[PDB]
Subunit: 155 residues, 4 copies
């Protein structure tokens, strides 16, 4: 079949925050682990279940800074700008309804606080490195290094 | 990230032949597990390691009967026919270079026998069911219910 | 840009039922042309313009017989079965929520009759033939050799 | 059925360089029209027929300036950088083998000169606009507002 790992994939060293606000590296996540998610509409946090993990590799990645704290993923990531109230990407697929993510846009923290993007750069690796896409039921999002990231595998 | 699973996917029940010819359900297989692979060009068997497992859901499936034996997978699969010397799918995507898999075509067993397909059926579930795709390192193939299948995770 | 042509493509000598009631070979269809379409919802016939025509190649085709007439197309077509009230393909994509088209299933005639599928055959050409995908406005369906086929390009 | 438009698509008023060095708006190009092309290995200009035009729509677009002149396209374009000798994209797919396109990278003019990229913007539009992918035989490339662009209609 054809899968759309939409919201992209994160490097092994990326930290996912649990329902108990603890942190584990995405490559140590397992089916049924309970992670901190966010209802956009109801404007409230809530625990949800990891259904699926997909492991790929890539040599071409994207670093986003939001203060001293950063995150490394594919260019087809999806993050929430709570000030803009839009899902955004550096590289959105034509006809997804996702806005362009830019330098000095906002991300939503795992404490629901607005964080300002300080820098956005491309990043190649000498050889390919592992990347991970996790699916979360109902909310379909989580917190990668403490900011709200959407993730869904479809088709 | 748009990921093409080339071999399609198999129901959780599907038996995988391990390097040492023991059987393991595909929903038990873990990264690093050593599976009975096959070098097509060389016509020689080989042990190889699983690097990736992908789980998705489907309620539209395909049952290939080859005598009394059978395998249940997605309709876009890739089984090797050792008579025609071709990888075959019941439902090839246009201009993919995969031939139609038809009634009375041949599959390759884990021993290296030619096994004849006696029936191809559609199978529908009233609930979506879990399906599994395994990436094998070098030869990117394995024995599903005793017959040779290709599988590959490819980025687009 | 990745473009899913929902409804597949038809060979050159496939007959399209025009607005003007006459038949026309799909390889002659031009943008603006008005074809006979159907509203499944309204259960009435309508005239709609062709907004887009994709042309491609293939050597692997699907023949569907209904009475003493047939249609030739890619295996990932989409036809309406009026008996079941479902869109069907011989080869549906798992995710698509499309049902299997089978022997003795029904198609909808351009005059709203239920015609029985007598034979479905998968065949090859010695070298590729041109296949055509036509998008139709608002209804997104037309009549191929007198039976109702869906077609819609999306990203 | 599933069709990858490798090379993205251009806005209707984008200019295509014809074989005789005349210009035509891409939204007027027709099957059999002759366009200017480049062989990278031969490092010479060829003339080729357009075999296929695919028309879609988009609200997310990309503008690339090379001095006074610009080109507007989808973010999954492919332009030849003749300085680094690589096909490039603002937004390449993780496994495509395509480098990133950035400020102060180069493009190849329809007369064979390096043209420096001076600006890359990404802009939403409020209503979707028409966009056009064209298939050129043999070289699968053409000149879009005077710079070398790749385009190919491939099944998955
Ligand atoms: Ca069984
Ligand atoms: Hg980036
Ligand atoms: Hg089948
Ligand atoms: Hg068929
Ligand atoms: Hg851009």
């Amino acid at each position: 079949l054809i899968l759309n790992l939409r919201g992209g994939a994160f490097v092994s060293n990326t930290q996912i925050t649990m329902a108990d606000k603890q942190k584990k590296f995405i490559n140590e996540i397992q089916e049924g682990d309970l992670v901190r998610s966010y209802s956009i509409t109801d404007e409230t946090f809530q625990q949800n279940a990891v259904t699926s993990i997909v492991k790929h590799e890539a040599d071409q990645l994207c670093q986003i800074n939001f203060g001293k704290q950063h995150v490394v993923c594919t260019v087809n990531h999806r993050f929430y700008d709570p000030e803009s109230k839009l899902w955004k990407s550096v590289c959105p697929h034509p006809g997804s309804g996702i806005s362009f993510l830019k330098k000095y846009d906002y991300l939503l923290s795992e404490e629901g606080e607005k964080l300002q993007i300080t820098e956005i750069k491309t990043f190649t690796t000498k050889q390919p490195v592992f990347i991970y896409h996790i699916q979360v039921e109902n909310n379909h999002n989580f917190f990668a290094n403490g900011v709200l990231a959407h993730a869904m595998q479809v088709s």
